[PDB]
Amino acid sequence: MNIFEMLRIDEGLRLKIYKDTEGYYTIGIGHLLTKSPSLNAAKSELDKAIGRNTNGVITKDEAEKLFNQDVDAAVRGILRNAKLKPVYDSLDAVRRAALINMVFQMGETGVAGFTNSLRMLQQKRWDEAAVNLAKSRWYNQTPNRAKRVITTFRTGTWDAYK
Numbered sequence: 001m002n003i004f005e006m007l008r009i010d011e012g013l014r015l016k017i018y019k020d021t022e023g024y025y026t027i028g029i030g031h032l033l034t035k036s037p038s039l040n041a042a043k044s045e046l047d048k049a050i051g052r053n054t055n056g057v058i059t060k061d062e063a064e065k066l067f068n069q070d071v072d073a074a075v076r077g078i079l080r081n082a083k084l085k086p087v088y089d090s091l092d093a094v095r096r097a098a099l100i101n102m103v104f105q106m107g108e109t110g111v112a113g114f115t116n117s118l119r120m121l122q123q124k125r126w127d128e129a130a131v132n133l134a135k136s137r138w139y140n141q142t143p144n145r146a147k148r149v150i151t152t153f154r155t156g157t158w159d160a161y162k
């Protein structure tokens, strides 16, 4: 297992524009297009993202290309962020993937807001971080996904994904 296989399980793959769990237009492997209620705005962000006139449908290669870029961007956002970088640097390789998964889902700013959890993660107080991570809108809106990510932080293994 690695970050790619993990996020592919968590996000799925859809080749036509769809609404994510928050109701936002999305494509591919959780690639958010726009928070705007307009499908036309979404189609326009999609064409711009892909570089061709898509009419709301992309190929598998194209979905995986956006996915590669988004994973890359999630990593870059962690390393650029003063609150996220030291936590990531402190973590082993499996728990690093859990942090990338959170940033991919909710963005660098959203994750940087988990001040107390991040501190516990840095201190390697795994059971405590896991309890604090769960007291969140994130956990109450997407409990199954959040539980898998939290379990990864708690155990440092891929057991929730196997």
Ligand SMILES: [Cl-]
Residues within 6 Å of the ligand: 049
């Ligand atoms: Cl893009």
Ligand SMILES: [Cl-]
Residues within 6 Å of the ligand: 141, 142, 143, 144, 145, 146
């Ligand atoms: Cl979920």
